Design a protein around this ligand. Structure first.
Ligand SMILES: [Zn+2]
Length: 471
């Protein structure tokens, strides 16, 4: 069961929470004044999502939020990471405010605080207002810094007297990778893609604009709101672990190149004020240059670093070659490997990319501690999925998820006990929800959602957390 884990096994005041995102749980996608995001248009195109499903209703948290908050409190969590939908506040992404949308987040935030649950609020979670994509070209346009800052400003003004823990973005690497390299997420751009694109250049343009937009929003927070509000603003980054296939110079170099192209891409700017040296060397003039002033705005602009940690891969090296550029992915010059010494790195959850590798959590946290001067880290997502088509009972007996959290949290504890500055931990997800391309065929929740009736039923993993987290 608990394997020696409890609140006593983590630092004093360590924060435990659950996570959702707006599009994935809210529903009311085209109601309450909400304007469409790029994901509304994408999900409504036949063939884009499993079963042609979309987030129109999702879990209907929009109407059930008090139930869901009561549930998280009963499970002994301290905090709730959720996102604000940009197009629910500004249906066109700019200009007119949707007061009904504002009232919703006010009500949610107020109920959370009434129930002693700390709001950790993300401003952006894959859900660019469609109007901004069409008018400005979204994250390809440097104008996003101003547009996002004006959005962030409104949210600081409106909610910041109560909200003290902000994140700007969630996984800008995946936006760059899937939206602009592989072209499998909106705006579906890539070199060969019907929508247009260039997998060798656009992922880098997009990432740069995320970084500049983050820095601009934080500068605004610090100069205008911080003195009165006394809150903090961070950013959420995905980091999956990379382990050298062997101890050869070439495999070790490859594992490190992957770390740099994955997490260093954002962390080196945020902490050190420059892109990783290997990216400068390999990507060259396809990698934008921060001016000294921009680098100084970007450096130190995150009060904490959100890490989404799920899995680990073995990495195999090769001699670095002069190559015609094709994509961000090919720029790493690495070879993914999922077995060493005849054994897989881990069994898979429902998602093909998700190998259950608890030691990857220690890998990531230890690495950030040693390389980046031990910045304040929050584990902003960790979890695993069940497949579609199970019975209610099968969903509830999620013994693999129980084992997943015990193991991963034991490895996190190991890293913390070695001195890593980790302030909190958040389980993805509170609820089974809209899992993007997989739709409702992937179940990440500690609480089961019957998507016919919308009823919530805690799984064994929810009760595991309740037991582990009791005060
Ligand atoms: Zn409803």
């Amino acid at each position: 069961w608990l394997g020696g884990l409890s609140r006593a096994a983590f630092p004093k005041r360590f924060v435990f929470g659950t996570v959702t995102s707006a599009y994935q749980v809210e529903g009311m996608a085209a109601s309450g004044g909400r304007g469409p995001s790029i994901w509304d248009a994408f999900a409504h195109t036949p063939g884009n999502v499993a079963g042609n499903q979309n987030g129109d209703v999702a879990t209907d948290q929009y109407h059930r939020y008090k139930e869901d908050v009561n549930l998280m409190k009963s499970l002994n969590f301290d905090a709730y990471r959720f996102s604000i939908s940009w197009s629910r506040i500004f249906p066109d992404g700019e200009g007119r405010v949707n007061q009904e949308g504002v009232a919703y987040y006010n009500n949610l935030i107020n109920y959370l605080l009434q129930k002693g649950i700390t709001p950790y609020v993300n401003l952006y979670h894959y859900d660019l207002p469609l109007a901004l994509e069409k008018k400005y070209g979204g994250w390809l346009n440097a104008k996003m810094a101003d547009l996002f800052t004006e959005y962030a400003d409104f949210c600081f003004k409106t909610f910041g007297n109560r909200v003290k823990h902000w994140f700007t973005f969630n996984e800008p690497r995946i936006v760059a990778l899937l939206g602009y390299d592989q072209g499998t997420n909106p705006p579906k751009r890539c070199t060969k893609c019907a929508a247009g694109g260039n997998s060798a250049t656009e992922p880098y343009i997009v990432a740069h604009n995320f970084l500049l937009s983050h820095a601009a929003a934080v500068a605004r927070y610090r100069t205008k709101y911080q003195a009165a509000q006394q809150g903090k603003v961070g950013i959420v980054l995905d980091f999956n672990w990379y382990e050298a296939l062997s101890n050869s110079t070439e495999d070790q170099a490859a594992a490190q190149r992957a770390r740099d192209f994955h997490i260093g891409w954002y962390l080196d700017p945020l902490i050190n004020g420059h892109y990783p040296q290997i990216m400068q060397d390999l990507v060259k003039d396809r990698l934008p240059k921060f001016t000294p002033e921009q680098a100084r705005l970007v450096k130190g602009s995150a009060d904490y670093i959100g890490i989404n940690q799920y899995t680990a891969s073995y990495m195999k090296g090769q001699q670095l070659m002069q190559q015609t550029p094709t994509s961000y992915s090919a720029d790493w010059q690495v070879t993914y490997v999922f077995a060493k010494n005849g054994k897989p790195i881990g069994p898979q959850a429902n998602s093909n990319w998700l190998y259950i590798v608890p030691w990857g959590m220690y890998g990531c946290v230890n690495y950030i501690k040693q390389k980046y001067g031990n910045p304040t880290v929050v584990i902003t997502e960790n979890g695993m999925d069940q497949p579609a088509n199970l019975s209610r009972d099968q969903y509830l007996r999620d013994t693999t998820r129980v084992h997943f959290y015990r193991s991963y949290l034991t490895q996190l504890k190991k890293a913390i006990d070695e001195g890593a500055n980790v302030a909190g931990y958040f389980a993805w997800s509170l609820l089974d929800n809209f899992e993007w391309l997989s739709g409702y065929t992937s179940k990440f929740g500690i609480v089961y959602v019957d998507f016919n009736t919308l009823e919530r039923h805690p799984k064994a993993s929810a009760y595991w957390f309740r037991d582990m987290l009791k005060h």
